[model samples]
Each structure stands twice: as structure tokens, then as C-alpha cells.
Target: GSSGSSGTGEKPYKCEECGKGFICRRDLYTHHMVHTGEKPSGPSSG
Candidate 1:
């Protein structure tokens, strides 16, 4: 008599903008920037 037992796997964070699933919340947040026209702060365009 279990309460939560779907037998699928770990819950994935999905993006509504692109219908993409991420393994963690942080990854989802990073991907969201793409839809918002935002870029990650760093260097490497040479």
C-alpha cells in the first residue's frame, strides 16, 4: 500500500517554450534563457 509509486523514473523539469526536458532544475533555468533572448555571462567568442 504505497502512496507514491509511478515506476517511471526521476521527475524531469520540462520547458513549456520548447518542450524540452532537463535532468535538473538548474539546467532547465539555463535553457529558459534561450527563449528569453538572454546569454550566459562569460567569455569565449574568439
Candidate 2:
């Protein structure tokens, strides 16, 4: 259930650390993991 496509004039989330822009908060958080080498826990791990 997406809202069309990522057209122009719709990017609201901006990364302060690297000045990268993301359409969603979750996407931004995922990018942060690259900078910190963060690992996700839960069923994915043992």
C-alpha cells in the first residue's frame, strides 16, 4: 500500500549527520545502521 511514487517536492526526512534525505523514518534508521554497524535482534538472531 504505497502512495504512488517518490516524486519531486515530497522528501521531508533529512539526515543531519550526513545530509542524506529519506522518504520514510524507517529508511533513515536503516541507513544509520551502516554508520554504526548496528545489528537487529529477535528471531533473526540466536
Cα displacement (Å) at residue 35, model 1 = 0.4
| Segments in model 1 whose C-alpha atoms lie over 4 Å from true places | 1-11, 38-46
Task: Write one digit per residue (lDDT tens) for candidate 1, span 1-46.
Answer: 7477778775478898878877888989898888897446657342
| CA lDDT, every model vs. true structure | 0.76, 0.74
Model 1 weakest lDDT span, ten residues long: 37-46
Candidate 2 residue-wise lDDT, 1-46, digit = tens: 9587766675678776677888898898888877685447667573
Q: Which lDDT value does model 1 have at 4? A: 73
Q: How far is candidate 2 from the true structure (C-alpha RMSD, Å)?
A: 8.6
Which number leads on TM-score?
A: 1
lDDT of 2 at 24: 95
Question: What are the models' TM-scores?
Answer: 0.52, 0.49
